[PDB]
Design a protein around this nucleic acid. Structure first.
Ligand SMILES: [Mg+2]
Ligand SMILES: [Mg+2]
Lengths: 162, 206, 56, 35, 19, 292
RNA sequence: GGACCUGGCGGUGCUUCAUAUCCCUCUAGAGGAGCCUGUUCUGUAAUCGAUAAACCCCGAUCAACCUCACCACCUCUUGCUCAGCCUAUAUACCGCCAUCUUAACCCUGAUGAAGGCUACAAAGUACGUUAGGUCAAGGUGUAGCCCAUGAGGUGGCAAGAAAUGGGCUACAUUUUCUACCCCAGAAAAUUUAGC
């Protein structure tokens, strides 16, 4: 119920009326999402929400109690197929200061990982994309970190000749 | 061109703006007030308000350029100026008491006077009218003769008969020759003024 | 309107995310649109006043 | 195919340019405008 | 597939719903 | 052609649609405004079309629907204007008024309006010679000792113009933690991008990416480029500069730094010096870039 | 036959200037060596004819001691599977590319052909077409040969000379090599475009 007009007017003309206007039909309109509708919808969707643990007031406690950060991506395209090959990638980020490492273990871990560890940030980043799924890549990243810790805390024979 | 026609070239002269308002004439005042309205192009890399700026030497360096290599061209120019300065100092030290008043050691004065001694005043225009080709004398504009002096100097210094003599040394020798009205460039000016003297009769074909 | 008003005065008939950077299957969407326009114009002969709009 | 790949180991719109232009020029290809 | 497209248009044609 | 009844119906429909939009977007209909109409219509119907006219618009009807239906006589047929039969009643009435003003006076930055603007204001087509004649009369009125009323009458016919020196942006002066005043700016040359900070007081120290300029710029040409801005306004050795440049080559970087540092130095000089720097070509971005 | 009207002059010269394209002016190369090709002549019985099909495994490459094509000789055939050939046809269709074609009114001349401007103003206003290309990222039919247009074997074939057209390499002292990315040390005539 609006007299919306759309179009460049002709000389001594007017923008075309809405009835039969293809341009107004080509817009991805937001008539179905109005502030009143949005507020009503969000009032009914509150029932589905939990609460952030109030203890985690900011980041500073957030990397303290929950050190590991796992980043995973999802894609919304348009088409018949939902498959996107890039969604399998998983990125694990952990600050080495949180790992129970001594001096030798920290040295060994850092020069095992190489460029995955950033000296400025003290963060080790393992990117896993080998497996098809995302759960498999998350498991592989956790397994890699596990074996890396255990093999950094191990002193072989050649380790003697530093 | 990426500049609109509205854009006007910049005026880099630093003492022009410092002119007191009293000295400005009404035409000059009008021009200055007009310039406020106009758009001004960005001043190009090159000319600066530096007190050591010399447009003639800048043009000579640009004419020696090969492939946009301005660093090497300016290097050759400064080496030539230094070589001329050192040769003049060497000839000044070994000169008698009275001969030291007639030795110019400023390389800029030498460069300017040497180029001025090579400027031809009359040149020729290739013109074929009657099925056979004809040279005709013409008066050269000042820009044309200034260009011809530099072009002759550079072409002479790029000659191949100079084997393994580096360009700064060749150019300093040619500049010091032309400073004293000697050398092949002065001879090229004379063979143009004479071979345009042999063709005064064709001057009616202008 | 001429083609050079496609983003100035004219819009786009077909709308899909395929052509965006990173998104895939732009060619498949193009073929879908080609077949779909042909079939709409063949199924409603003389009824379509104007081109379609294919939204996804 | 796979057999060929194995023995080797042992050792944008998919349309014609013009059909692209008509769809592109008529606004039928999303997001493809003229510069 | 030019095939699957091709017969479908002509198949629907003699049924009396396409062009 | 649009009848008055059509426009009246459009007005009623527009009022109803305004109330409907206000209901839709949750605002109060009573205080709902035209800027609100534009914002709401843009949100509900997003459009990326560059032509602002092409974008969907909801306006008061009269703003689109034009009208030039000037009726010059009534039911009896008598024309309203006593100069009607000339065919140019507005123009000749204006000429008559000007002539009367000139008779009265005899008893006692800007431009002339263009021909088409006089057409629009008079709502009548006129040739070029009669516009010349009107402008001659206006100039004659200007020459005489025109009074305040006559000055206003002339000012009805003189449009305005602007300059291009006030559009020069002089950056604000900031203060660092130590209490030192400074000014920041940006410059661009080819692919090189420079960001310069000029301190009000200094000793002529320029730091390019944390490196002294004579070390960052071996080539004398670039050092001269950096010198040009201060030498032009005679402030060599009076300012400290800290600049960060990225991209391009040696000469592009030097030009970008020169532009950025001149734009920063504009804050500490007089407006006359700012204009002189503009006229010297120092405050203008060079648009010459590589072509395809 | 007399007088007049519109003309067209498929027009021709000169005078003056606007006089840009093209001139002069500026920069740059483009001759010469070595090889590969396009065309011609000569020669053979023949093809210096080709590798979704070989050498070649620095770059590239030629003939390979491969297979197909060609020349001279020969062999088999109911053969493979009611066999087999890639043989023609878009000069059969479709698809794809390309060509070409597709005003009114008002005045003046006595209401003749006809004419209509002056600004300090004097009648002027308003889709087909194609002996088209493509059988390489595509199809639907149509024809041919089947004691040979199928399958084999034995030898040969692997050119020569110019004049011109094109292309590929190295060509330096304002250079080259090392360190650095610029304050060091060692080496030694026509044209053609372009602003
Ligand atoms: Mg054909
Ligand atoms: Mg052969």
């Amino acid at each position: 119920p609006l007299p919306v007009r759309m179009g460049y007017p002709v000389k001594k003309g007017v923008p075309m009326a809405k009835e039969g206007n293809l341009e107004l039909l080509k817009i991805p309109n937001f008539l179905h999402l109005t502030p009143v509708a949005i507020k009503k919808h969000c009032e009914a969707l509150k029932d589905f929400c939990t609460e952030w643990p109030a203890a985690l007031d900011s980041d500073e406690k957030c990397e303290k109690h929950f050190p590991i950060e796992i980043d995973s991506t999802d894609y919304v395209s348009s088409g018949p197929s939902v498959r996107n090959p890039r969604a399998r990638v998983v990125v694990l980020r952990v600050k080495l200061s949180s790992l129970n490492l001594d001096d030798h273990a920290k040295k060994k871990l850092i020069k095992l990982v190489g460029e995955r560890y950033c000296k400025t940030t003290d963060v080790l980043t393992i990117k896993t994309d080998r497996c098809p799924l995302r759960r498999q890549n998350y498991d592989y990243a956790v397994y890699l970190l596990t074996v890396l810790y255990h093999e950094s805390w191990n002193t072989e024979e050649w380790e003697k000749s530093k | 061109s990426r500049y609109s026609p509205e854009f006007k070239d910049p005026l880099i002269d630093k003492e022009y703006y410092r002119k007191p308002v009293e000295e400005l004439t009404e035409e000059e005042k009008y021009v200055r007030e007009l310039k406020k309205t106009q758009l001004i192009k960005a001043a190009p890399a090159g000319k600066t308000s530096s007190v050591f700026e010399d447009p003639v030497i800048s043009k000579f360096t640009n004419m020696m350029m090969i492939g946009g290599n301005k660093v090497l061209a300016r290097s050759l120019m400064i080496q030539t100026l230094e070589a001329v300065k050192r040769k003049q100092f060497e000839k000044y030290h070994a000169a008698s008491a009275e001969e030291q008043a007639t030795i110019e050691r400023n390389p800029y004065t030498i460069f300017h006077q040497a180029l001025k001694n090579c400027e031809p005043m009359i040149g020729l225009v290739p013109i074929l009218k009657g099925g056979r080709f004809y040279q005709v004398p013409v008066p050269l504009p000042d820009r044309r003769r200034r260009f011809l002096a530099m072009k002759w100097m550079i072409t002479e210094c790029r000659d191949k008969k100079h084997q393994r003599t580096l360009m700064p040394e060749k150019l300093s020798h040619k500049l010091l020759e032309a400073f004293h009205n000697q050398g092949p460039v002065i001879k090229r000016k004379h063979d143009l003024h004479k071979m345009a003297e042999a063709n005064r009769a064709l001057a009616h074909y202008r | 309107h001429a083609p050079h008003y496609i983003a100035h005065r004219k819009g786009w008939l077909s709308l899909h995310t395929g052509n965006l950077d990173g998104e895939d299957h732009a060619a498949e969407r193009t073929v879908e649109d080609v077949f779909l326009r042909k079939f709409m114009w063949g199924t409603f002969p003389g009824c379509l006043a104007d081109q379609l709009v294919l939204k996804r | 195919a796979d057999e060929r790949l194995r023995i080797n180991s042992l050792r944008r719109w998919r349309l014609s340019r013009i059909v692209f232009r008509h769809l592109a020029d008529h606004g039928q290809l999303s997001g493809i405008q003229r510069a | 597939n030019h095939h699957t497209y091709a017969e479908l248009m002509q198949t629907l044609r003699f049924l009396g719903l396409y062009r | 052609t649009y009848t008055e009844d059509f426009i009246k119906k459009q007005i009623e429909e527009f009022n109803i649609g305004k109330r409907h939009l206000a209901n839709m977007m949750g605002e109060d209909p009573e205080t709902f405004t035209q800027e609100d109409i534009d914002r709401a219509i843009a949100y509900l119907f997003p459009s990326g079309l560059f032509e602002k006219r092409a974008r969907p618009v909801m306006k008061h009807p009269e703003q689109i629907f034009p009208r030039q239906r000037a009726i010059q006589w009534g039911e009896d047929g008598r024309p309203f204007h006593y100069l009607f039969y000339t065919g140019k009643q507005s123009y000749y009435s204006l000429m008559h008024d000007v002539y009367g003003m000139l008779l009265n006076l005899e008893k006692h930055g800007s431009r002339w309006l263009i021909k088409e603007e006089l057409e629009e204001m008079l709502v009548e087509k006129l040739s070029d010679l009669d516009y010349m004649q009107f402008i001659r009369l206006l100039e004659k009125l200007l020459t005489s000792q025109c009074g305040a009323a006559e000055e206003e009458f002339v000012q009805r016919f003189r449009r305005s113009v602007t300059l291009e020196s006030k559009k020069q942006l002089i950056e604000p002066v900031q203060y660092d933690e130590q209490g030192m005043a400074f000014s920041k700016s940006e410059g661009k040359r080819k692919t090189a991008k420079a960001e310069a900070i000029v301190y009000k007081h200094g000793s002529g120290r320029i730091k390019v990416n944390g490196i002294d300029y004579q070390l960052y710029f071996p080539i004398t040409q670039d050092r001269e480029q950096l010198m040009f801005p201060f030498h032009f306004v005679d402030r060599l050795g009076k300012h400290d500069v800290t600049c960060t440049v990225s991209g391009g080559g040696r000469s592009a970087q030097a030009g970008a730094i020169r532009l950025a540092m001149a734009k920063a130095l504009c804050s500490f000089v007089t407006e006359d010096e700012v204009e002189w720097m503009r006229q010297a070509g120092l405050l203008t971005t060079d648009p010459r870039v590589r072509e395809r």
